[model samples]
Target: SGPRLRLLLLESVSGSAPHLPGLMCLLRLHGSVGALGALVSLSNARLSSIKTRFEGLCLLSLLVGESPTELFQQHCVSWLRSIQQVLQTQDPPATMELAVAVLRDLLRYAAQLPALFRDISMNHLPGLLTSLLGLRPECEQSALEGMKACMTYFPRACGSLKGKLASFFLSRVDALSPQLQQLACECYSRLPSLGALKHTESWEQELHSLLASLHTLLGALYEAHVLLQLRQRFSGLARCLGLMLSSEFGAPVSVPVQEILDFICRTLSVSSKNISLHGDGPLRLLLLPSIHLEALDLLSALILACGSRLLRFGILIGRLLPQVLNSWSIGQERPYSTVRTKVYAILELWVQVCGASAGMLQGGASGEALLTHLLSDISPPHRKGDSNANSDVCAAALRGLSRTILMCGPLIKEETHRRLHDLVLPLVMGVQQGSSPYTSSRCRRELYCLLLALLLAPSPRCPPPLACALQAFSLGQREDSLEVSSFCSEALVTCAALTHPRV
Candidate 1:
């Protein structure tokens, strides 16, 4: 019956000029468990064609609510093992592509069945990835597509492959085409998701190794391409950093919180210095508004993660921030208004997060003096009679002062608060009024919310002025345009909820 069944299946496939849909249904009906067993018994020459048919069948089955886990366990995993066996003896381009296609299909189902891929490891995959790497440019491209699919489906499994992957990638760095090089970088980008450094005890060492590997891999791309891609992926990297900062690490970890800060500071300093001096080609091309916005976003993340640590690397942070700020400002004049808006948003976030740290104010009078100097430098210069000339700088300065006040609290002398109130309130008000149409309404609402919070909090100074400012802003908002009205209504509800003692 088995022999007859196989014969009939082949006949059905051969008789119908386009047998793919029918064969697909047969496999789906039979399930991978039954079909995969028959598939592995076929000759190698016929295996490739059969495997292609299998992938199509599996994909179609998935669309129809069929599960392929058993099929992967019975056939796909074994098929990968077979490829490993033949890897040294045979040129694996065709077989590798087939395997890749099969794995890609498996990935679609793996999200629901993560254990299916989790059980498969680097050893099963590296041979195929290496073989894919060995192919010519076009073939290599296909292999990369396969590798990407595998990573997307089984990111955790990919981490296990890192040691072998790093070595293999480094060995072929010089031989890779531009496209392949880009793929290699993307693969590296996936490493963090795969828990690459999560197990490390030393944050500094872990970050060092990770950054070094990235620098080495990215360095291989044309300097210009490296900068462009870095600019492109900067936000993703920033998001990763934010997640890391918020993650909890126990005390036994070799690197303490302070060390982590130092590591971040050093890494940022090195990258900024390198780009400033050695990064002419791609860096020059990336001077556009879009890239500028992305760079600012990245900078904002770095500042948030390492703000408390910046106290230890004062000179470096001071130097780098101005350059970053200047670059963003220059890009604001370009055609991409969205870029300007994003930059402003990031700057606001930086002020909110880092500016509030207690460490930022602990350097004695010298620390306070240095911070005041830095703020002066970062403040946007005034242009005669231009209402909005210094708005961005002023907003940042007020946020910085507010942070200092929060950090210093009772320790700050009366005169300090007086100066802060005098210099910062007007600027905050100015920012509320002069912000771009895209951001003004939100900014005003946030500023009012912040002032309200400050007023209710315990402080050495009285809250009368802040209260008055909130009242004035609230009254103005009531009579303002529709946008302001909506923002104010939402802001008022939030403020009322926070102020309420009852739920």
Candidate 2:
């Protein structure tokens, strides 16, 4: 009964040529490659009717589905070239639909059918891509599916597709549907890794295109699902930019670092604003919590990858970085202790490398707020278990404090100074014997240097800066390392000489 039912089904559908190829192969009258050649011969003639050509392609899809591995090794390029040429001249909607489907089926076997890509005669490849990119939206879906198969399995074709379609991928990033946006942005994101865009002069243009896509994405409003998709898009953009600037490039290209920094700042701001605003709904708020953290990750990569390039943005960093520090604390403290640690580390880098063009955060209300936040960050964690995490934060805070003072003497208000002095004095007096945040000798030295800076700068009103310096000196005397104590003694003497000039 089973065999008879199958035979009956085949006979009923045999009127269409699409089903006949598989039936012929089942009978073993013609091998898979031989059947494919017959179809190619029929499809190759420009004089063939569109219906005949379409039937030939239908047969080819069947032949490809059952073709042995050896079939593609010998005849795959001919099959691909013949199909691409036949489809190039056939613009009827029905014919192209079948054409894209045929290509998609061939590409499905890209692993064994690497010849699926070898015949790029560019003569037919660009026109093929144009149709792939130009087809009705549904056909474009099939087109992307086929190209994705190529991109995944064929390195040679992957490089060629990226080179040819760089702009198309970027343009699709703003597509109305998220699926298209994801595919296009993802493909675009992989460009730099393939060694595309090698000219240093083109790096800026490539970066500008990515940034512009991000700008358009952020500037618009969306639902939670769209926002969720945007999160990945931002992630891809960050990764793409990182790869472009990474060590693979040998030397960093000179880009508009200031503008790139501005985009990051804006992304951070938008994330903060969306997460905090009441009218945006709780669902929306929940959707955006981690985006700001992603932005910080991006900034860290930027600084690490191009530290020298960023040194020029000293004042820009000063003005913008303080706001980032303030926003993280000002909004609400969530489970972002790692983010807190990272932000402090970025500050430390900024102060350490860009010290010469410094101190924009020293004189204004921004300065006062930043000092308050840094001091708050330096304080030990309220939870005893959290002390270890705060160690890095406190140390980074101390480095930023001391460096800013060294460069410009904290042009802060007396209130700000008193707070800074209060924060520094306890560490100066605290013992480092057991379970202390100052267990890191690095943190300990950072504290000592900060204390010395305070002593050298204008004295705070209540607690004498000189007296605080003496406490650090006392703490220094208890140190086991004579080198540390000797440095401490020199710092105390320098403070005394600077404070009492007539002495």
Candidate 3:
């Protein structure tokens, strides 16, 4: 029965596409353990050929979102380990690509079975990362995809290899192409999110050492014209310094924040000015929505870090924001949904910082007045016919107002709060009630966040208005969507928590 069944299964797979769902049903109906055992027991030459076919079939299975549990996942681990040993002796490129592809699939499946990552050794991670770093431009995209999959699953595992990984990558920093250098920097930037397990006892010292190494790498890239070329590829890096100005909120590092900030500032200042002059070159291409979004994101991070210290660079950032906002605004005639989304995010950061300070700036009331004026000018024009303008502009304005209230607190006059409550709240409600499902959902999500911000505000004035607004809004709550209902309920709960004083 076993040999006959194996023949029948192979015939089925050969005759039809080996999709995972059908394969899974077959594995369940007829045990996979016996079939995998036969493949494992085959001669080395036969096993090698079988393994290649198995990997191709597996990739197809994955594309169809079908998982072959018994054969592929349960048995493939050991098979790949055995294959790895043999492939190491042969010409590696084709074999490596196949192996990497299988590994990527394995990683995806492993998200449900995290223990699979434990099979990967620390010794192997550096080599994989290095190889991806080296051959990324030439190799199949699968290699990088595989590396990211490994990192995602094995963040802590990779953390164990950080010292070696950092050292190895840094040594070749000067030699890397512009693309590789950016990839390397992004990898480094991502280290903090990998969790703190990588740090040594003297983490500050080690971090400073890491920063110094990065500085060396970035400096070399700058000197080699790689930084300029990099700007073409990654315009956001040009503004990285402005964004990272206050590293206080970042993972604790020994490097002085000022030094890193200065490096970033000097680099971006040069790059942005150069890009601006090119009229419509690589720099212009770099200013694509994605790049500008990153730039705006970094600027927001800078605001979060520096807080009020952002005022020191106000002249510089002040010039950038209006241009950014204008470019995204309908008034500019180049309006894009992506640009608007990024602008909203940028404004959210500004709201967060300004809310933290209660809208008070060193320029005192005059500075506050100027900010208020700018906000008013950018406010969505309130005509009954202009639905798109009302939705986008109102959302942006509320985000800015939310941040101001958060930073400036009670300093924001009651009139401003009243205007926001009256103008913005009703618009959000209308969106929630609208027929277009997409816009309604988006408006609800943004409104939820906005309400949460208001509820969390540290001011005395916000609570009453917030509570009253919630009471008014709750009258129309829809029971069909549990998510929307829960969001509203949570906002109410947060308001209750804040009001109780124990919170």
Candidate 4:
């Protein structure tokens, strides 16, 4: 059967009139498991032979591509270990690339086979992924894809990769090949946040120069046609910008924050002009949406990097962001939805990061509309099955509202405080009552957190809401999730302190 599988795989590989029929015959006769068992045995034995190893890995790659992930779910870890050995050993150049390709194909199922993939050995994958980065661009890309999949889907894999992964990508961010550079920077973007000083200080200058290069590439002087031509280039620059902002380098490293901000503003202006004047022409079609979307993402990264320092520009961002949201909300396209999501995400980050300073928005009309918008998001579905029930927007609103109370509790007016207290108390009861469609686990968590924020947020009118909140929290104590119950316990403790007699 192993020999038959090999023969069929060889026939398939030779590109002679589709041997898939013969392969399917084996698949049916022995089943994918049995056939894969034979194929794995054949591939493992053949991998030791100089002449047959490349053929062996190619066959394995083909099998992996053809097989459903569940078919080999139990066997993926052993297969991954075998491939890691092949990757670790110096094999023929193309053979190693084929091996990495197989690894990528297996990891593509990481989300589906998360349990089995989690059991993958930590001892080998990170080293294999790191070494594969030294190979050709195609192999590097494959290795990065698998690395990202592992990092996302496997906690063990992320732990193993975290130490060396940042430096590896940073080293290659300035690689000569644009493809490699883009791949490297994007990998950096997705990594769990890292402090730059932990890695070598030498790369700081490299990133600084890289930042300078990005600012030049994305400058406002470029004409709309040139910008359109560089649309793909903007995506690469966006990733690099994300990397720069996220690393949180030392204060000495002068990031061109203002320059980049100005560039993003100019890009948005140009895109806005196209939207209004051209009204869906080639200019808007090709340039306005793409760069416009990229600018919003970079703006998000910028907000995170600036942290509380961003509040100085709160008035500006407060005005600009809502207009962006309003403009994009008018359209009914898929990209419009993306733009809106990004805009809401920015709003959430702005309020959360700026903390108490976010209260600065309370005085302005933009601030009023912004606060009202967030409050409206958490409002219960007006009618059952309302068409406007967007969980993503609502989730952000809940989080933003919670953070707002936690940060600006004392700053809020007494009237506003009473209203907010009345607003959230019932929502907490709704979750406890189980009558509301607040069925999303995240929404529930945020709702509890929002209530906690309200209870703890120093307010003079706390006594009445205090009693109601404790009742709601007592009911919340029965929640199935540990996090939610823990939240109730904490809320109960705060209530104890607030109600206790003081000396």
Question: Which has the greatest lDDT?
Answer: 4
TM-score of each: 0.49, 0.50, 0.54, 0.57
lDDT per residue as tens, model 1, 218-332: 3342245555555434333333333344344332334244443444344333232245445374454344444344334445555565555545554444444444444443313
| Candidate 3 off by > 4 Å | 1-17, 21-47, 50-52, 55-98, 104-138, 145-230, 233-252, 263-295, 300-400, 403-411, 425-440, 448-503
lDDT of candidate 4 vs native? 0.64
Of the candidates shown, which would achieve the greatest TM-score relative to the real structure? 4
Ranking by lDDT: 4, 2, 3, 1
Q: What is the C-alpha lDDT of each candidate?
A: 0.47, 0.60, 0.48, 0.64
Q: Between prediction 3 and prediction 4, which has the larger TM-score?
A: 4
Screening candidate 2 with a backbone cut-off below 3 angstroms (N, C-alpha, C), the clashing residue pairs are none
lDDT tens per residue, model 4, 387-424: 33455666776777777777877776666677777788
* Candidate 3 lDDT by residue in tens digits, 1-503: 77457535654454333464465456545543334333334322333554444444343333213335554556545544543443343434655565565566655565565455455544454455555545533443434444555565566666655665555434333333555444444444444434332343244443455445445544443332544444433432333233233332234433354554454344334333344435344544354454456455556655666566565555555445445555444422124545555555565576555444423322444444445533453333332332333345445545555565555645556555555566556655555551222243344555556555555653455443565557634732553456567677666666666567773
Q: Tell me the spans in candidate 4 whose CA falls farther than 4 Å from its real position.
A: 1-182, 186-229, 248-251, 269-293, 330-341, 347-354, 382-389, 431-437, 460-464, 479-486, 501-503
The CA-based lDDT of model 2 is what?
0.60
In model 4, what lDDT does residue 468 have?
81
Please list the residue runs of candidate 1 whose C-alpha ends up more than 4 Å from where it truly belongs after superposition: 1-119, 122-124, 134-164, 167-183, 189-357, 361-420, 423-442, 456-458, 464-467, 473-487, 494-503
Clash totals, every prediction: 1, 0, 13, 0
Which stretches in model 2 have alpha-carbon errors above 4 Å?
1-198, 219-229, 246-254, 271-284, 287-289, 300-316, 330-334, 381-389, 410-419, 432-445, 452-503
Error of 3 at 333 (Å): 6.6
> Model 2: per-residue lDDT, tens digit, 1-503?
54344434543454356555557466334332323444344444422566467556655665556566776556566666655665556356566656666676675564553344445422344445555665565455455654554444443445565656666665565565767765665566455544333645556677787778767766653335766667666656655565455434433467667777888778666544545456655655564445566567667667776665675665556666666776666322235456666677777666565554455455666666677677776665433343244566667778777777766564544665677677777766765323455655667777888878776665344444676578677778678766567778778778668667894
Sort the predicted structures by TM-score, highest score first: 4, 3, 2, 1
